[PDB]
Amino acid sequence: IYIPTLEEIKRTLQLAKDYSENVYFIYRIALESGVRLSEVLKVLKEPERDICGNDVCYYPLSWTRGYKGVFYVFHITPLKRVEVTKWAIADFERRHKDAIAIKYFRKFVASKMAELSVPLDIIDFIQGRKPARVLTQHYVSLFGIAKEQYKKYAEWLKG
């Protein structure tokens, strides 16, 4: 298993910014949140629903696949509307052969969150791998527990 280095992540962000401010921003929210590309595209299609606090922002997404559940896209940068072709990202990735593929940004987030002692199953929850079934104790508790761990990562991003 390979994991991107901070410098590969930064290089990619800088290339992304040159290519397009919107592609940069997709990458950036991928880096803040550790969610899948398709979930980042959903939150940026409708930034209205984003909730921000003193330290940290969150965007609830439903998940109705097998059971009905909820998870959150955590981040630190206020959202803005972004809609780009599906092809722009792929295009970006293809021209810069030193650019980290966006899907491997999650692996950087997990790795870094582990280094900051976020428990593995909160990492999974934060990343949207195991959404909380609605109206269960997990639903009651997980958001608040996740938010508190996410602050360690927010703190690190703010550098």
Listed by start position, the domains of the chain span: 1-159
Of 139, 120, 144, the residue nearest 69 (C-alpha): 139
Residue of 59, 106, 150, 153 with catalytic role:
106
The 3 state secondary structure assigned to the chain is CCCCCHHHHHHHHHHHHHHCHHHHHHHHHHHHHCCCHHHHHHHHHCHHHCEECCCCEEEEEEECCCCCEEEEEEECCCCCCCCCCHHHHHHHHHHCCCCCCHHHHHHHHHHHHHHCCCCHHHHHHHCCCCCEECCCHHHHHHHHHHHHHHHHHHHHHHC
Select from 116, 3, 128 the least CA-distant residue to 69.
128
Catalytic (active site) residue 139: yes
74 forms bridges with which residues in the sheet?
A: 58
Experimental method reported for this structure: X-ray
* Residue 28 near residue 48, CB atoms below 8 Å: no
Enter the tokens of residue 132.
């909380």
Structural fold of domain 1-159: hpI Integrase; Chain A (1.10.443)
Q: Measured between alpha carbons, how far is 45 from 43 in angstroms, rounded to an integer?
A: 6
Catalytic annotation present for 104: no
List all residues 6 or more positions away from 155 whose beta carbon is below 8 Å from its beta carbon.
55
Candidate list 19, 27, 28, 36, residue with the active-site label: 36
Nearest in space to 158 (alpha carbons), one of 36, 20, 56, 21: 56
Identify whether 94 is a catalytic site residue: no
- For tokens 């293809």, name the residue: 94
Residue 54 neighbours by CB distance under 10 Å: 5
List 11, 104, 129, 139, catalytic entry:
139
Q: Which of 136, 134, 114, 132 is nearest to 123 (CA)?
A: 114
